[PDB]
């Protein structure tokens, strides 16, 4: 059924972000993060995240950063791989102005538009009951082959293409099949719009069944 396929795709997609959010919520309660605010040892913080990520590599964000009350105090260096500089990191932090939910952000980078889901959670100081700042996780959708692979496999379809309006952002194609991404855009092809906090974004997932 076409509707079954769309519902499955929607559920798999949501499940990926749910898995990351469970991690994000748990990590943000760590004394390691809280202590970083005072002692600012980046090697300790990076080694902490490195250990977690390697234990569950398929449910991890592309990059992380931390803010205090004034601005960014740390990032994991990975944002730069997506054309994001310090000024753009600053803007992301300001764009995600509320906690505990994924927001879809289309941001201009040094290499063009990048399309992300970004979430922030507060870092509580349990000595005072005040918030020290926020922890952010960013998922970069563009060229996210691992995500597309997961979407294709877990939905038992032949291939998937992610688009923003009309423009392809990512796909699962091997390169040897009788069709390419243009053929899929311009075989049973189903369109599943992506909903983020009940708003229909410009993002759509296209499944290909042969
Ligand atoms: Ni999963
Ligand atoms: Ni940097
Ligand atoms: Ni949903
Ligand atoms: Ni097939």
List keywords for this structure.
signaling protein, Beta-Lactamase, 210 residues, five-stranded antiparallel β-sheet, alpha+beta, four-stranded antiparallel β-sheet, autoinducer-2 (AI-2), binds nickel (II) ion, PER/arnt/simple-minded (PAS) fold, 9 strands, Anthopleurin-A
Give a nutshell description of this structure.
The PDB classes it as signaling protein. The chain has 6 helices and 9 strands; from the N terminus they run αααββαβββαββαββ.
- Portion of residues in beta strands equals 25-35%
Radius of gyration: 18 Å
Count of individual helical segments: 6
Which structural category fits the helices and strands? Answer: alpha+beta
Task: Give a list of the ligands.
Answer: nickel (II) ion
Total count of domains = 2
Subcellular location: Cell inner membrane
Protein name: Autoinducer 2 sensor kinase/phosphatase LuxQ
Organism: Vibrio harveyi (Beneckea harveyi)
Subunit structure: Binds the complex formed by AI-2 and LuxP.
Question: In terms of topology, how is this protein built?
Answer:
Elements: H1 2-27, H2 31-39, H3 42-55, E1 63-67, E2 72-75, H4 86-95, E3 103-109, E4 112-125, E5 130-140, H5 145-154, E6 159-164, E7 167-171, H6 181-185, E8 188-196, E9 199-209
Antiparallel strand pairs: 1-2, 1-5, 3-4, 4-5, 6-7, 6-9, 8-9
Helix pairs in contact: 1-5
The structure holds nickel (II) ion (4 copies).
One nickel (II) ion is lined by residues 75, 77, 80.
């Amino acid at each position: 059924s076409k509707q079954q396929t769309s519902a499955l795709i929607h559920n798999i997609f949501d499940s990926h972000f749910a898995a990351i959010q469970i991690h994000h919520d748990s990590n943000s309660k760590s004394e390691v993060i809280r202590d970083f605010y005072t002692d600012r040892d980046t090697d300790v913080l990076n080694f902490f995240f490195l250990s977690i990520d390697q234990s569950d590599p398929s449910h991890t964000p592309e990059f992380r950063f931390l803010t205090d009350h004034k601005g960014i105090i740390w990032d994991d260096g990975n944002a730069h791989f997506y054309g994001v500089n310090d000024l753009i990191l600053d803007s992301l932090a300001n764009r995600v102005s509320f906690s505990n939910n994924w927001y879809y952000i289309n941001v201009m980078t040094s290499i063009g538009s990048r399309h992300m889901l970004v979430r922030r959670v507060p870092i509580l100081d349990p000595s005072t009951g005040e918030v020290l700042g926020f922890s952010f996780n960013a998922v970069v959708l563009d060229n996210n082959f691992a995500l597309m692979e997961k979407l294709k496999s877990e939905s038992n379809v032949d291939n998937v293409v992610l688009v923003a309006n009309s423009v392809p952002l990512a796909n699962s194609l091997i390169g040897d099949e009788p069709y390419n991404v243009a053929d899929v855009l311009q075989l049973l092809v189903i369109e599943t719009p992506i909903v983020v906090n009940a708003v229909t974004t410009e993002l759509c997932l296209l499944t290909v069944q042969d």
